């Protein structure tokens, strides 16, 4: 197709062998056969003519990379230039992590429909995967406000190990 199974795991199909014991013909074979010979075949014929027409004049496009830049943890206070470079990179990291959750949601939705009735247990691995994504995404970006910024993200982050330091020190006793 146009992707890889490692990003969208679709377990290999399991199709049965249709062997109708009853002598009366199966109609569903007939409407499928006429559909191929009346609709599907002209569609394929037009598509291949379209594909070769595209192949004659091939113009290419590439993908834009953004080289890693210093983030806001090493950004000097009131350094407006490093403020901008850090803020833009963090928001770009925000967009990709939003898409990371987007991918996991698609896999989970595929987990439901593909299993149908057996959605509960067949791909609970999808459920725990989304559990790890959503929980970590909660402490990573959630509750940052409509004016979220890399300074705010550190502020929320700093609250975690500060609370964690108190807990573990209490735990060590």
């Amino acid at each position: 197709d146009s992707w890889d199974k490692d990003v969208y795991p679709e377990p290999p199909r399991r199709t049965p062998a249709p062997a109708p014991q009853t002598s009366l013909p199966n109609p569903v074979t007939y409407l499928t056969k006429i559909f191929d010979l009346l609709v599907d075949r002209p569609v394929t014929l037009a598509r291949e003519f379209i594909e070769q027409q595209h192949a004659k004049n091939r113009y290419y496009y590439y993908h834009r990379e953004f080289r890693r830049v210093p983030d806001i943890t090493e950004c000097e206070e009131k350094d407006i230039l490093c403020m901008f470079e850090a803020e833009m990179q963090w928001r770009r990291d925000y967009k990709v992590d939003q898409e990371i959750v987007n991918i996991i949601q698609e896999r989970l939705k595929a987990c439901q429909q593909r299993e149908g009735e057996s959605y509960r247990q067949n791909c609970a691995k999808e459920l725990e995967q989304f559990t790890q994504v959503s929980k970590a995404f909660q402490d990573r970006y959630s509750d940052l406000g409509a004016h979220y910024s890399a300074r705010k993200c550190l502020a929320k982050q700093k609250q975690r190990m500060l609370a964690e330091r108190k807990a573990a020190k209490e735990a060590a006793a």
């Binding site: 407006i80 403020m83 803020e87 833009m88 770009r92 409509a146 004016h147 979220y148 910024s149």
Partner: protein
């Protein structure tokens, strides 16, 4: 900008020196053309706001408003050109001068980069509007209405001016960028409390908020149609644009202080829509309808969550195009019957068949069916408000239930009924009216396909 501001300014000498009768033609030509040019700014980059010069910049919030204002400019021209065709050439030229000037301030305000520059032009919009409502108004209460509109806006704006210059002396520059990247924690203190109140009240009055809203039923109803749109379709959102920008610094004091405003808007929006349930003037019906929608924007801003800001801009743009439409609708009847009472002209679908259809989609857009942009805005706020508090869905939905009754109420009272016997001057709708109405609703339904353009700066 310079690429939109300069053509806008250059329309001013063009209309003044235009031909005697070609004023309406040429002004409509290029105002549509300038709107086409402003479609270029609908694109926004990844996260950094589109910056052109030091004084002018755009983001994924200003540009959706910029196109709305410049697209509006042709609409006021055709709507007003009905009655304005019966006065002196200079008087008509003076009007087109004033709409062009009024639009000019709106374009420059929305792309202002310095908060002081924002405030100067934000308040400067009063002068073109104030003269519109007063000089060319068609009633007697306009004289009191103009004073109410001017004084309410100014009484709130003046504390902002004192507050704004205070930020300049203390923090430094007030550029919308340097403010964002140098946000400092506004700690809870009585001086900060009034700092918060001053920077907020100015934009609240122009929303308007429940209680600081009595200027709207006077200003909007008495204003001429070329004005009756802008006081409801763009410059109410101008107060909205002020809120979403000024709240960059007002954290975290906003959540502690937002409670009086939330309760006033969240409870008052039920009362305001209750006024619409029993009204006598069609213009007042839509006017109070605007208050309910803007009140929903008022609460939306203050949670300061990604979903709320999106639904804020979505409703903000959609309501403006909607509320502008209904004012065109009330204008058509008000010209034919020369009165604003609802029950006077009951029965229009019998006589005007397509006018009912335009009224149907107009009242439907206010009804906010899915996937209309009104619904895509209100629904987003409901989810954001519900996450803030579960109880608010009782109030949020109650308006959604209440807004159905009145939004279809003028549909029943005016269109769906026996035609009034005594009235005999109803004429087949001019192709200007129908063309204008299509210019309102066609972009709205077309916008439904791609809400990303108008979804705000957080998509």
């Amino acid at each position: 900008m310079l690429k939109i501001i300069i053509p806008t300014t250059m329309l001013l000498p063009m209309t003044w020196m235009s031909k005697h009768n070609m004023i309406w033609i040429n002004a409509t030509v290029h105002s549509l053309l300038i709107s086409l040019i402003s479609l270029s700014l609908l694109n926004q980059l990844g996260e950094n706001s589109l910056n052109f010069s030091l004084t002018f910049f755009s983001d994924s919030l200003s540009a959706p408003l910029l196109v709305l204002t410049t697209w509006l400019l042709p609409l006021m021209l055709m709507a007003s050109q009905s009655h304005l065709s019966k006065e002196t050439t200079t008087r008509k030229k003076l009007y087109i001068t004033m709409l062009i000037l009024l639009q000019l301030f709106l374009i420059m305000t929305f792309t202002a980069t310095e908060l002081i520059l924002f405030y100067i032009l934000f308040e400067a919009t009063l002068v073109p509007t104030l003269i519109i409502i007063t000089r060319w108004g068609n009633q007697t209460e306009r004289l009191n209405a103009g004073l109410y509109f001017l004084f309410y806006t100014l009484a709130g704006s003046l504390p902002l001016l004192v507050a704004l210059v205070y930020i300049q002396n203390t923090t430094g520059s007030l550029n919308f960028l340097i403010i964002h990247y140098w946000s400092h924690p506004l700690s809870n203190s009585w001086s900060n409390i009034f700092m918060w109140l001053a920077c907020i009240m100015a934009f609240m009055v122009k929303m308007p908020l429940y209680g600081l809203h009595l200027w709207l039923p006077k200003a909007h109803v008495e204003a001429p149609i070329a004005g009756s749109m802008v006081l409801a379709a763009v410059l109410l959102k101008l107060g909205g644009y002020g809120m979403m920008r000024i709240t960059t610094i007002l954290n975290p004091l906003t959540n502690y202080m937002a409670y009086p405003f939330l309760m006033l808007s969240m409870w008052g929006m039920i009362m305001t829509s209750s006024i619409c349930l029993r009204q006598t003037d069609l213009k007042s019906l839509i006017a109070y309808s605007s208050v309910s929608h803007m009140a929903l924007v008022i609460v939306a801003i203050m949670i300061q969550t990604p979903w709320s800001f999106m639904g804020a801009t979505a409703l903000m743009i959609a309501h403006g195009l909607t509320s502008s439409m209904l004012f065109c609708l009330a204008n058509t009847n008000y010209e034919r019957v020369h009165s604003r009472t609802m029950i006077l002209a009951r029965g229009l679908q019998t006589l005007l068949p397509l006018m009912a259809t335009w009224w149907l989609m107009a009242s439907l857009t206010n009804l906010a069916l899915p996937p209309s942009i009104n619904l895509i805005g209100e629904l987003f706020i409901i989810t954001a408000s519900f996450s803030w508090s579960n109880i608010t869905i009782i109030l949020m939905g109650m308006n959604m239930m209440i807004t159905a009754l009145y939004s279809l109420y003028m549909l029943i009272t005016t269109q769906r009924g026996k035609y009034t016997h005594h009235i005999n001057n109803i004429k087949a709708s001019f192709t200007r009216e129908n063309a204008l109405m299509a210019l309102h609703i066609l972009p709205l339904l077309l916008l439904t396909l791609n809400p990303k353009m108008i979804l705000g700066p957080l998509y």
